[PDB]
Structures are given as C-alpha cells and as structure tokens.
Amino acid sequence: RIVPVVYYLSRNGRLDHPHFIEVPLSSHNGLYLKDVINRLNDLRGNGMACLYSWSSKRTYKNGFVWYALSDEDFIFPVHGQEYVLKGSQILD
C-alpha cells in the first residue's frame, strides 16, 4: 500500500510551497520515518533528506505542534489519514 505525504521544507523560514509525494508502506498499519526517507532517497537522491531534521504535525492544546522524529519512529496522522511533515534545514 502507498500513503499520501505532504512535507514543508524550512530553510530561513519556509520560503516555499509544500511538496506532495506517495510513500510505499513497509507495514500495513503504520508509516515510519524511515519509509518517508527511503522514498525521498529514491526521488531526490540520498543527499537530500539528511539535510533536514524531520517532524510530523500533531494535535496540541488548541492547535498543533511539530513533533520531532527519529528514523526509527512511527508517524501518527493528523485529521483524515493525513500525513504532514516538516523538514527543518540543519545548520552546521
């Protein structure tokens, strides 16, 4: 199965529209960050996703919070099986 993922890249402060990709699932009850990163590696090259620290949008108080993810972490959806991530440019 494949799931829809929207991601926002943030450099100075997200000077750009989000991207939409379809991500192949490794397990049928859940998406892991590694699944997203594998798909980006295929589309954008191995050198892209490692430039960013990844978060997923999650409900918090009266809005949302960007919840920091590791490669091995499970990603929870927001709203209706909707997956929204943010890659924040690593500054080193």
Coordinates of C-alpha atoms in Angstrom, one line a residue, residues 7-52:
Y7 CA 6.0 17.9 3.5
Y8 CA 7.2 21.5 4.1
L9 CA 10.9 22.3 3.9
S10 CA 12.0 25.2 6.1
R11 CA 15.3 26.9 5.4
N12 CA 15.3 30.6 6.6
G13 CA 11.6 30.2 7.2
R14 CA 9.8 28.0 4.7
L15 CA 10.2 30.3 1.6
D16 CA 8.3 27.6 -0.5
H17 CA 5.1 25.6 -1.0
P18 CA 4.9 22.1 0.4
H19 CA 5.5 19.0 -1.6
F20 CA 3.2 16.0 -2.1
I21 CA 4.6 12.5 -2.5
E22 CA 3.3 9.0 -2.3
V23 CA 5.1 6.7 0.1
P24 CA 5.2 2.9 -0.1
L25 CA 4.4 1.3 3.3
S26 CA 6.6 -1.3 4.9
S27 CA 4.0 -2.3 7.5
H28 CA 0.3 -2.2 6.8
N29 CA -0.8 -0.4 10.0
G30 CA 1.6 2.5 10.0
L31 CA 4.1 4.7 8.4
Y32 CA 7.7 5.1 9.8
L33 CA 10.0 8.0 9.2
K34 CA 12.4 5.5 7.5
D35 CA 9.6 4.8 4.9
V36 CA 9.4 8.5 4.0
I37 CA 13.2 8.9 3.9
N38 CA 13.5 5.8 1.7
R39 CA 11.0 7.3 -0.8
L40 CA 12.8 10.7 -0.7
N41 CA 16.2 9.0 -1.3
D42 CA 14.6 7.4 -4.4
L43 CA 13.1 10.6 -5.7
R44 CA 15.6 13.3 -4.6
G45 CA 18.9 11.4 -4.1
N46 CA 20.5 10.1 -0.9
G47 CA 21.9 13.5 -0.2
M48 CA 18.6 15.3 0.3
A49 CA 16.7 14.0 3.3
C50 CA 19.8 14.0 5.5
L51 CA 20.0 17.8 5.2
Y52 CA 16.8 18.2 7.3

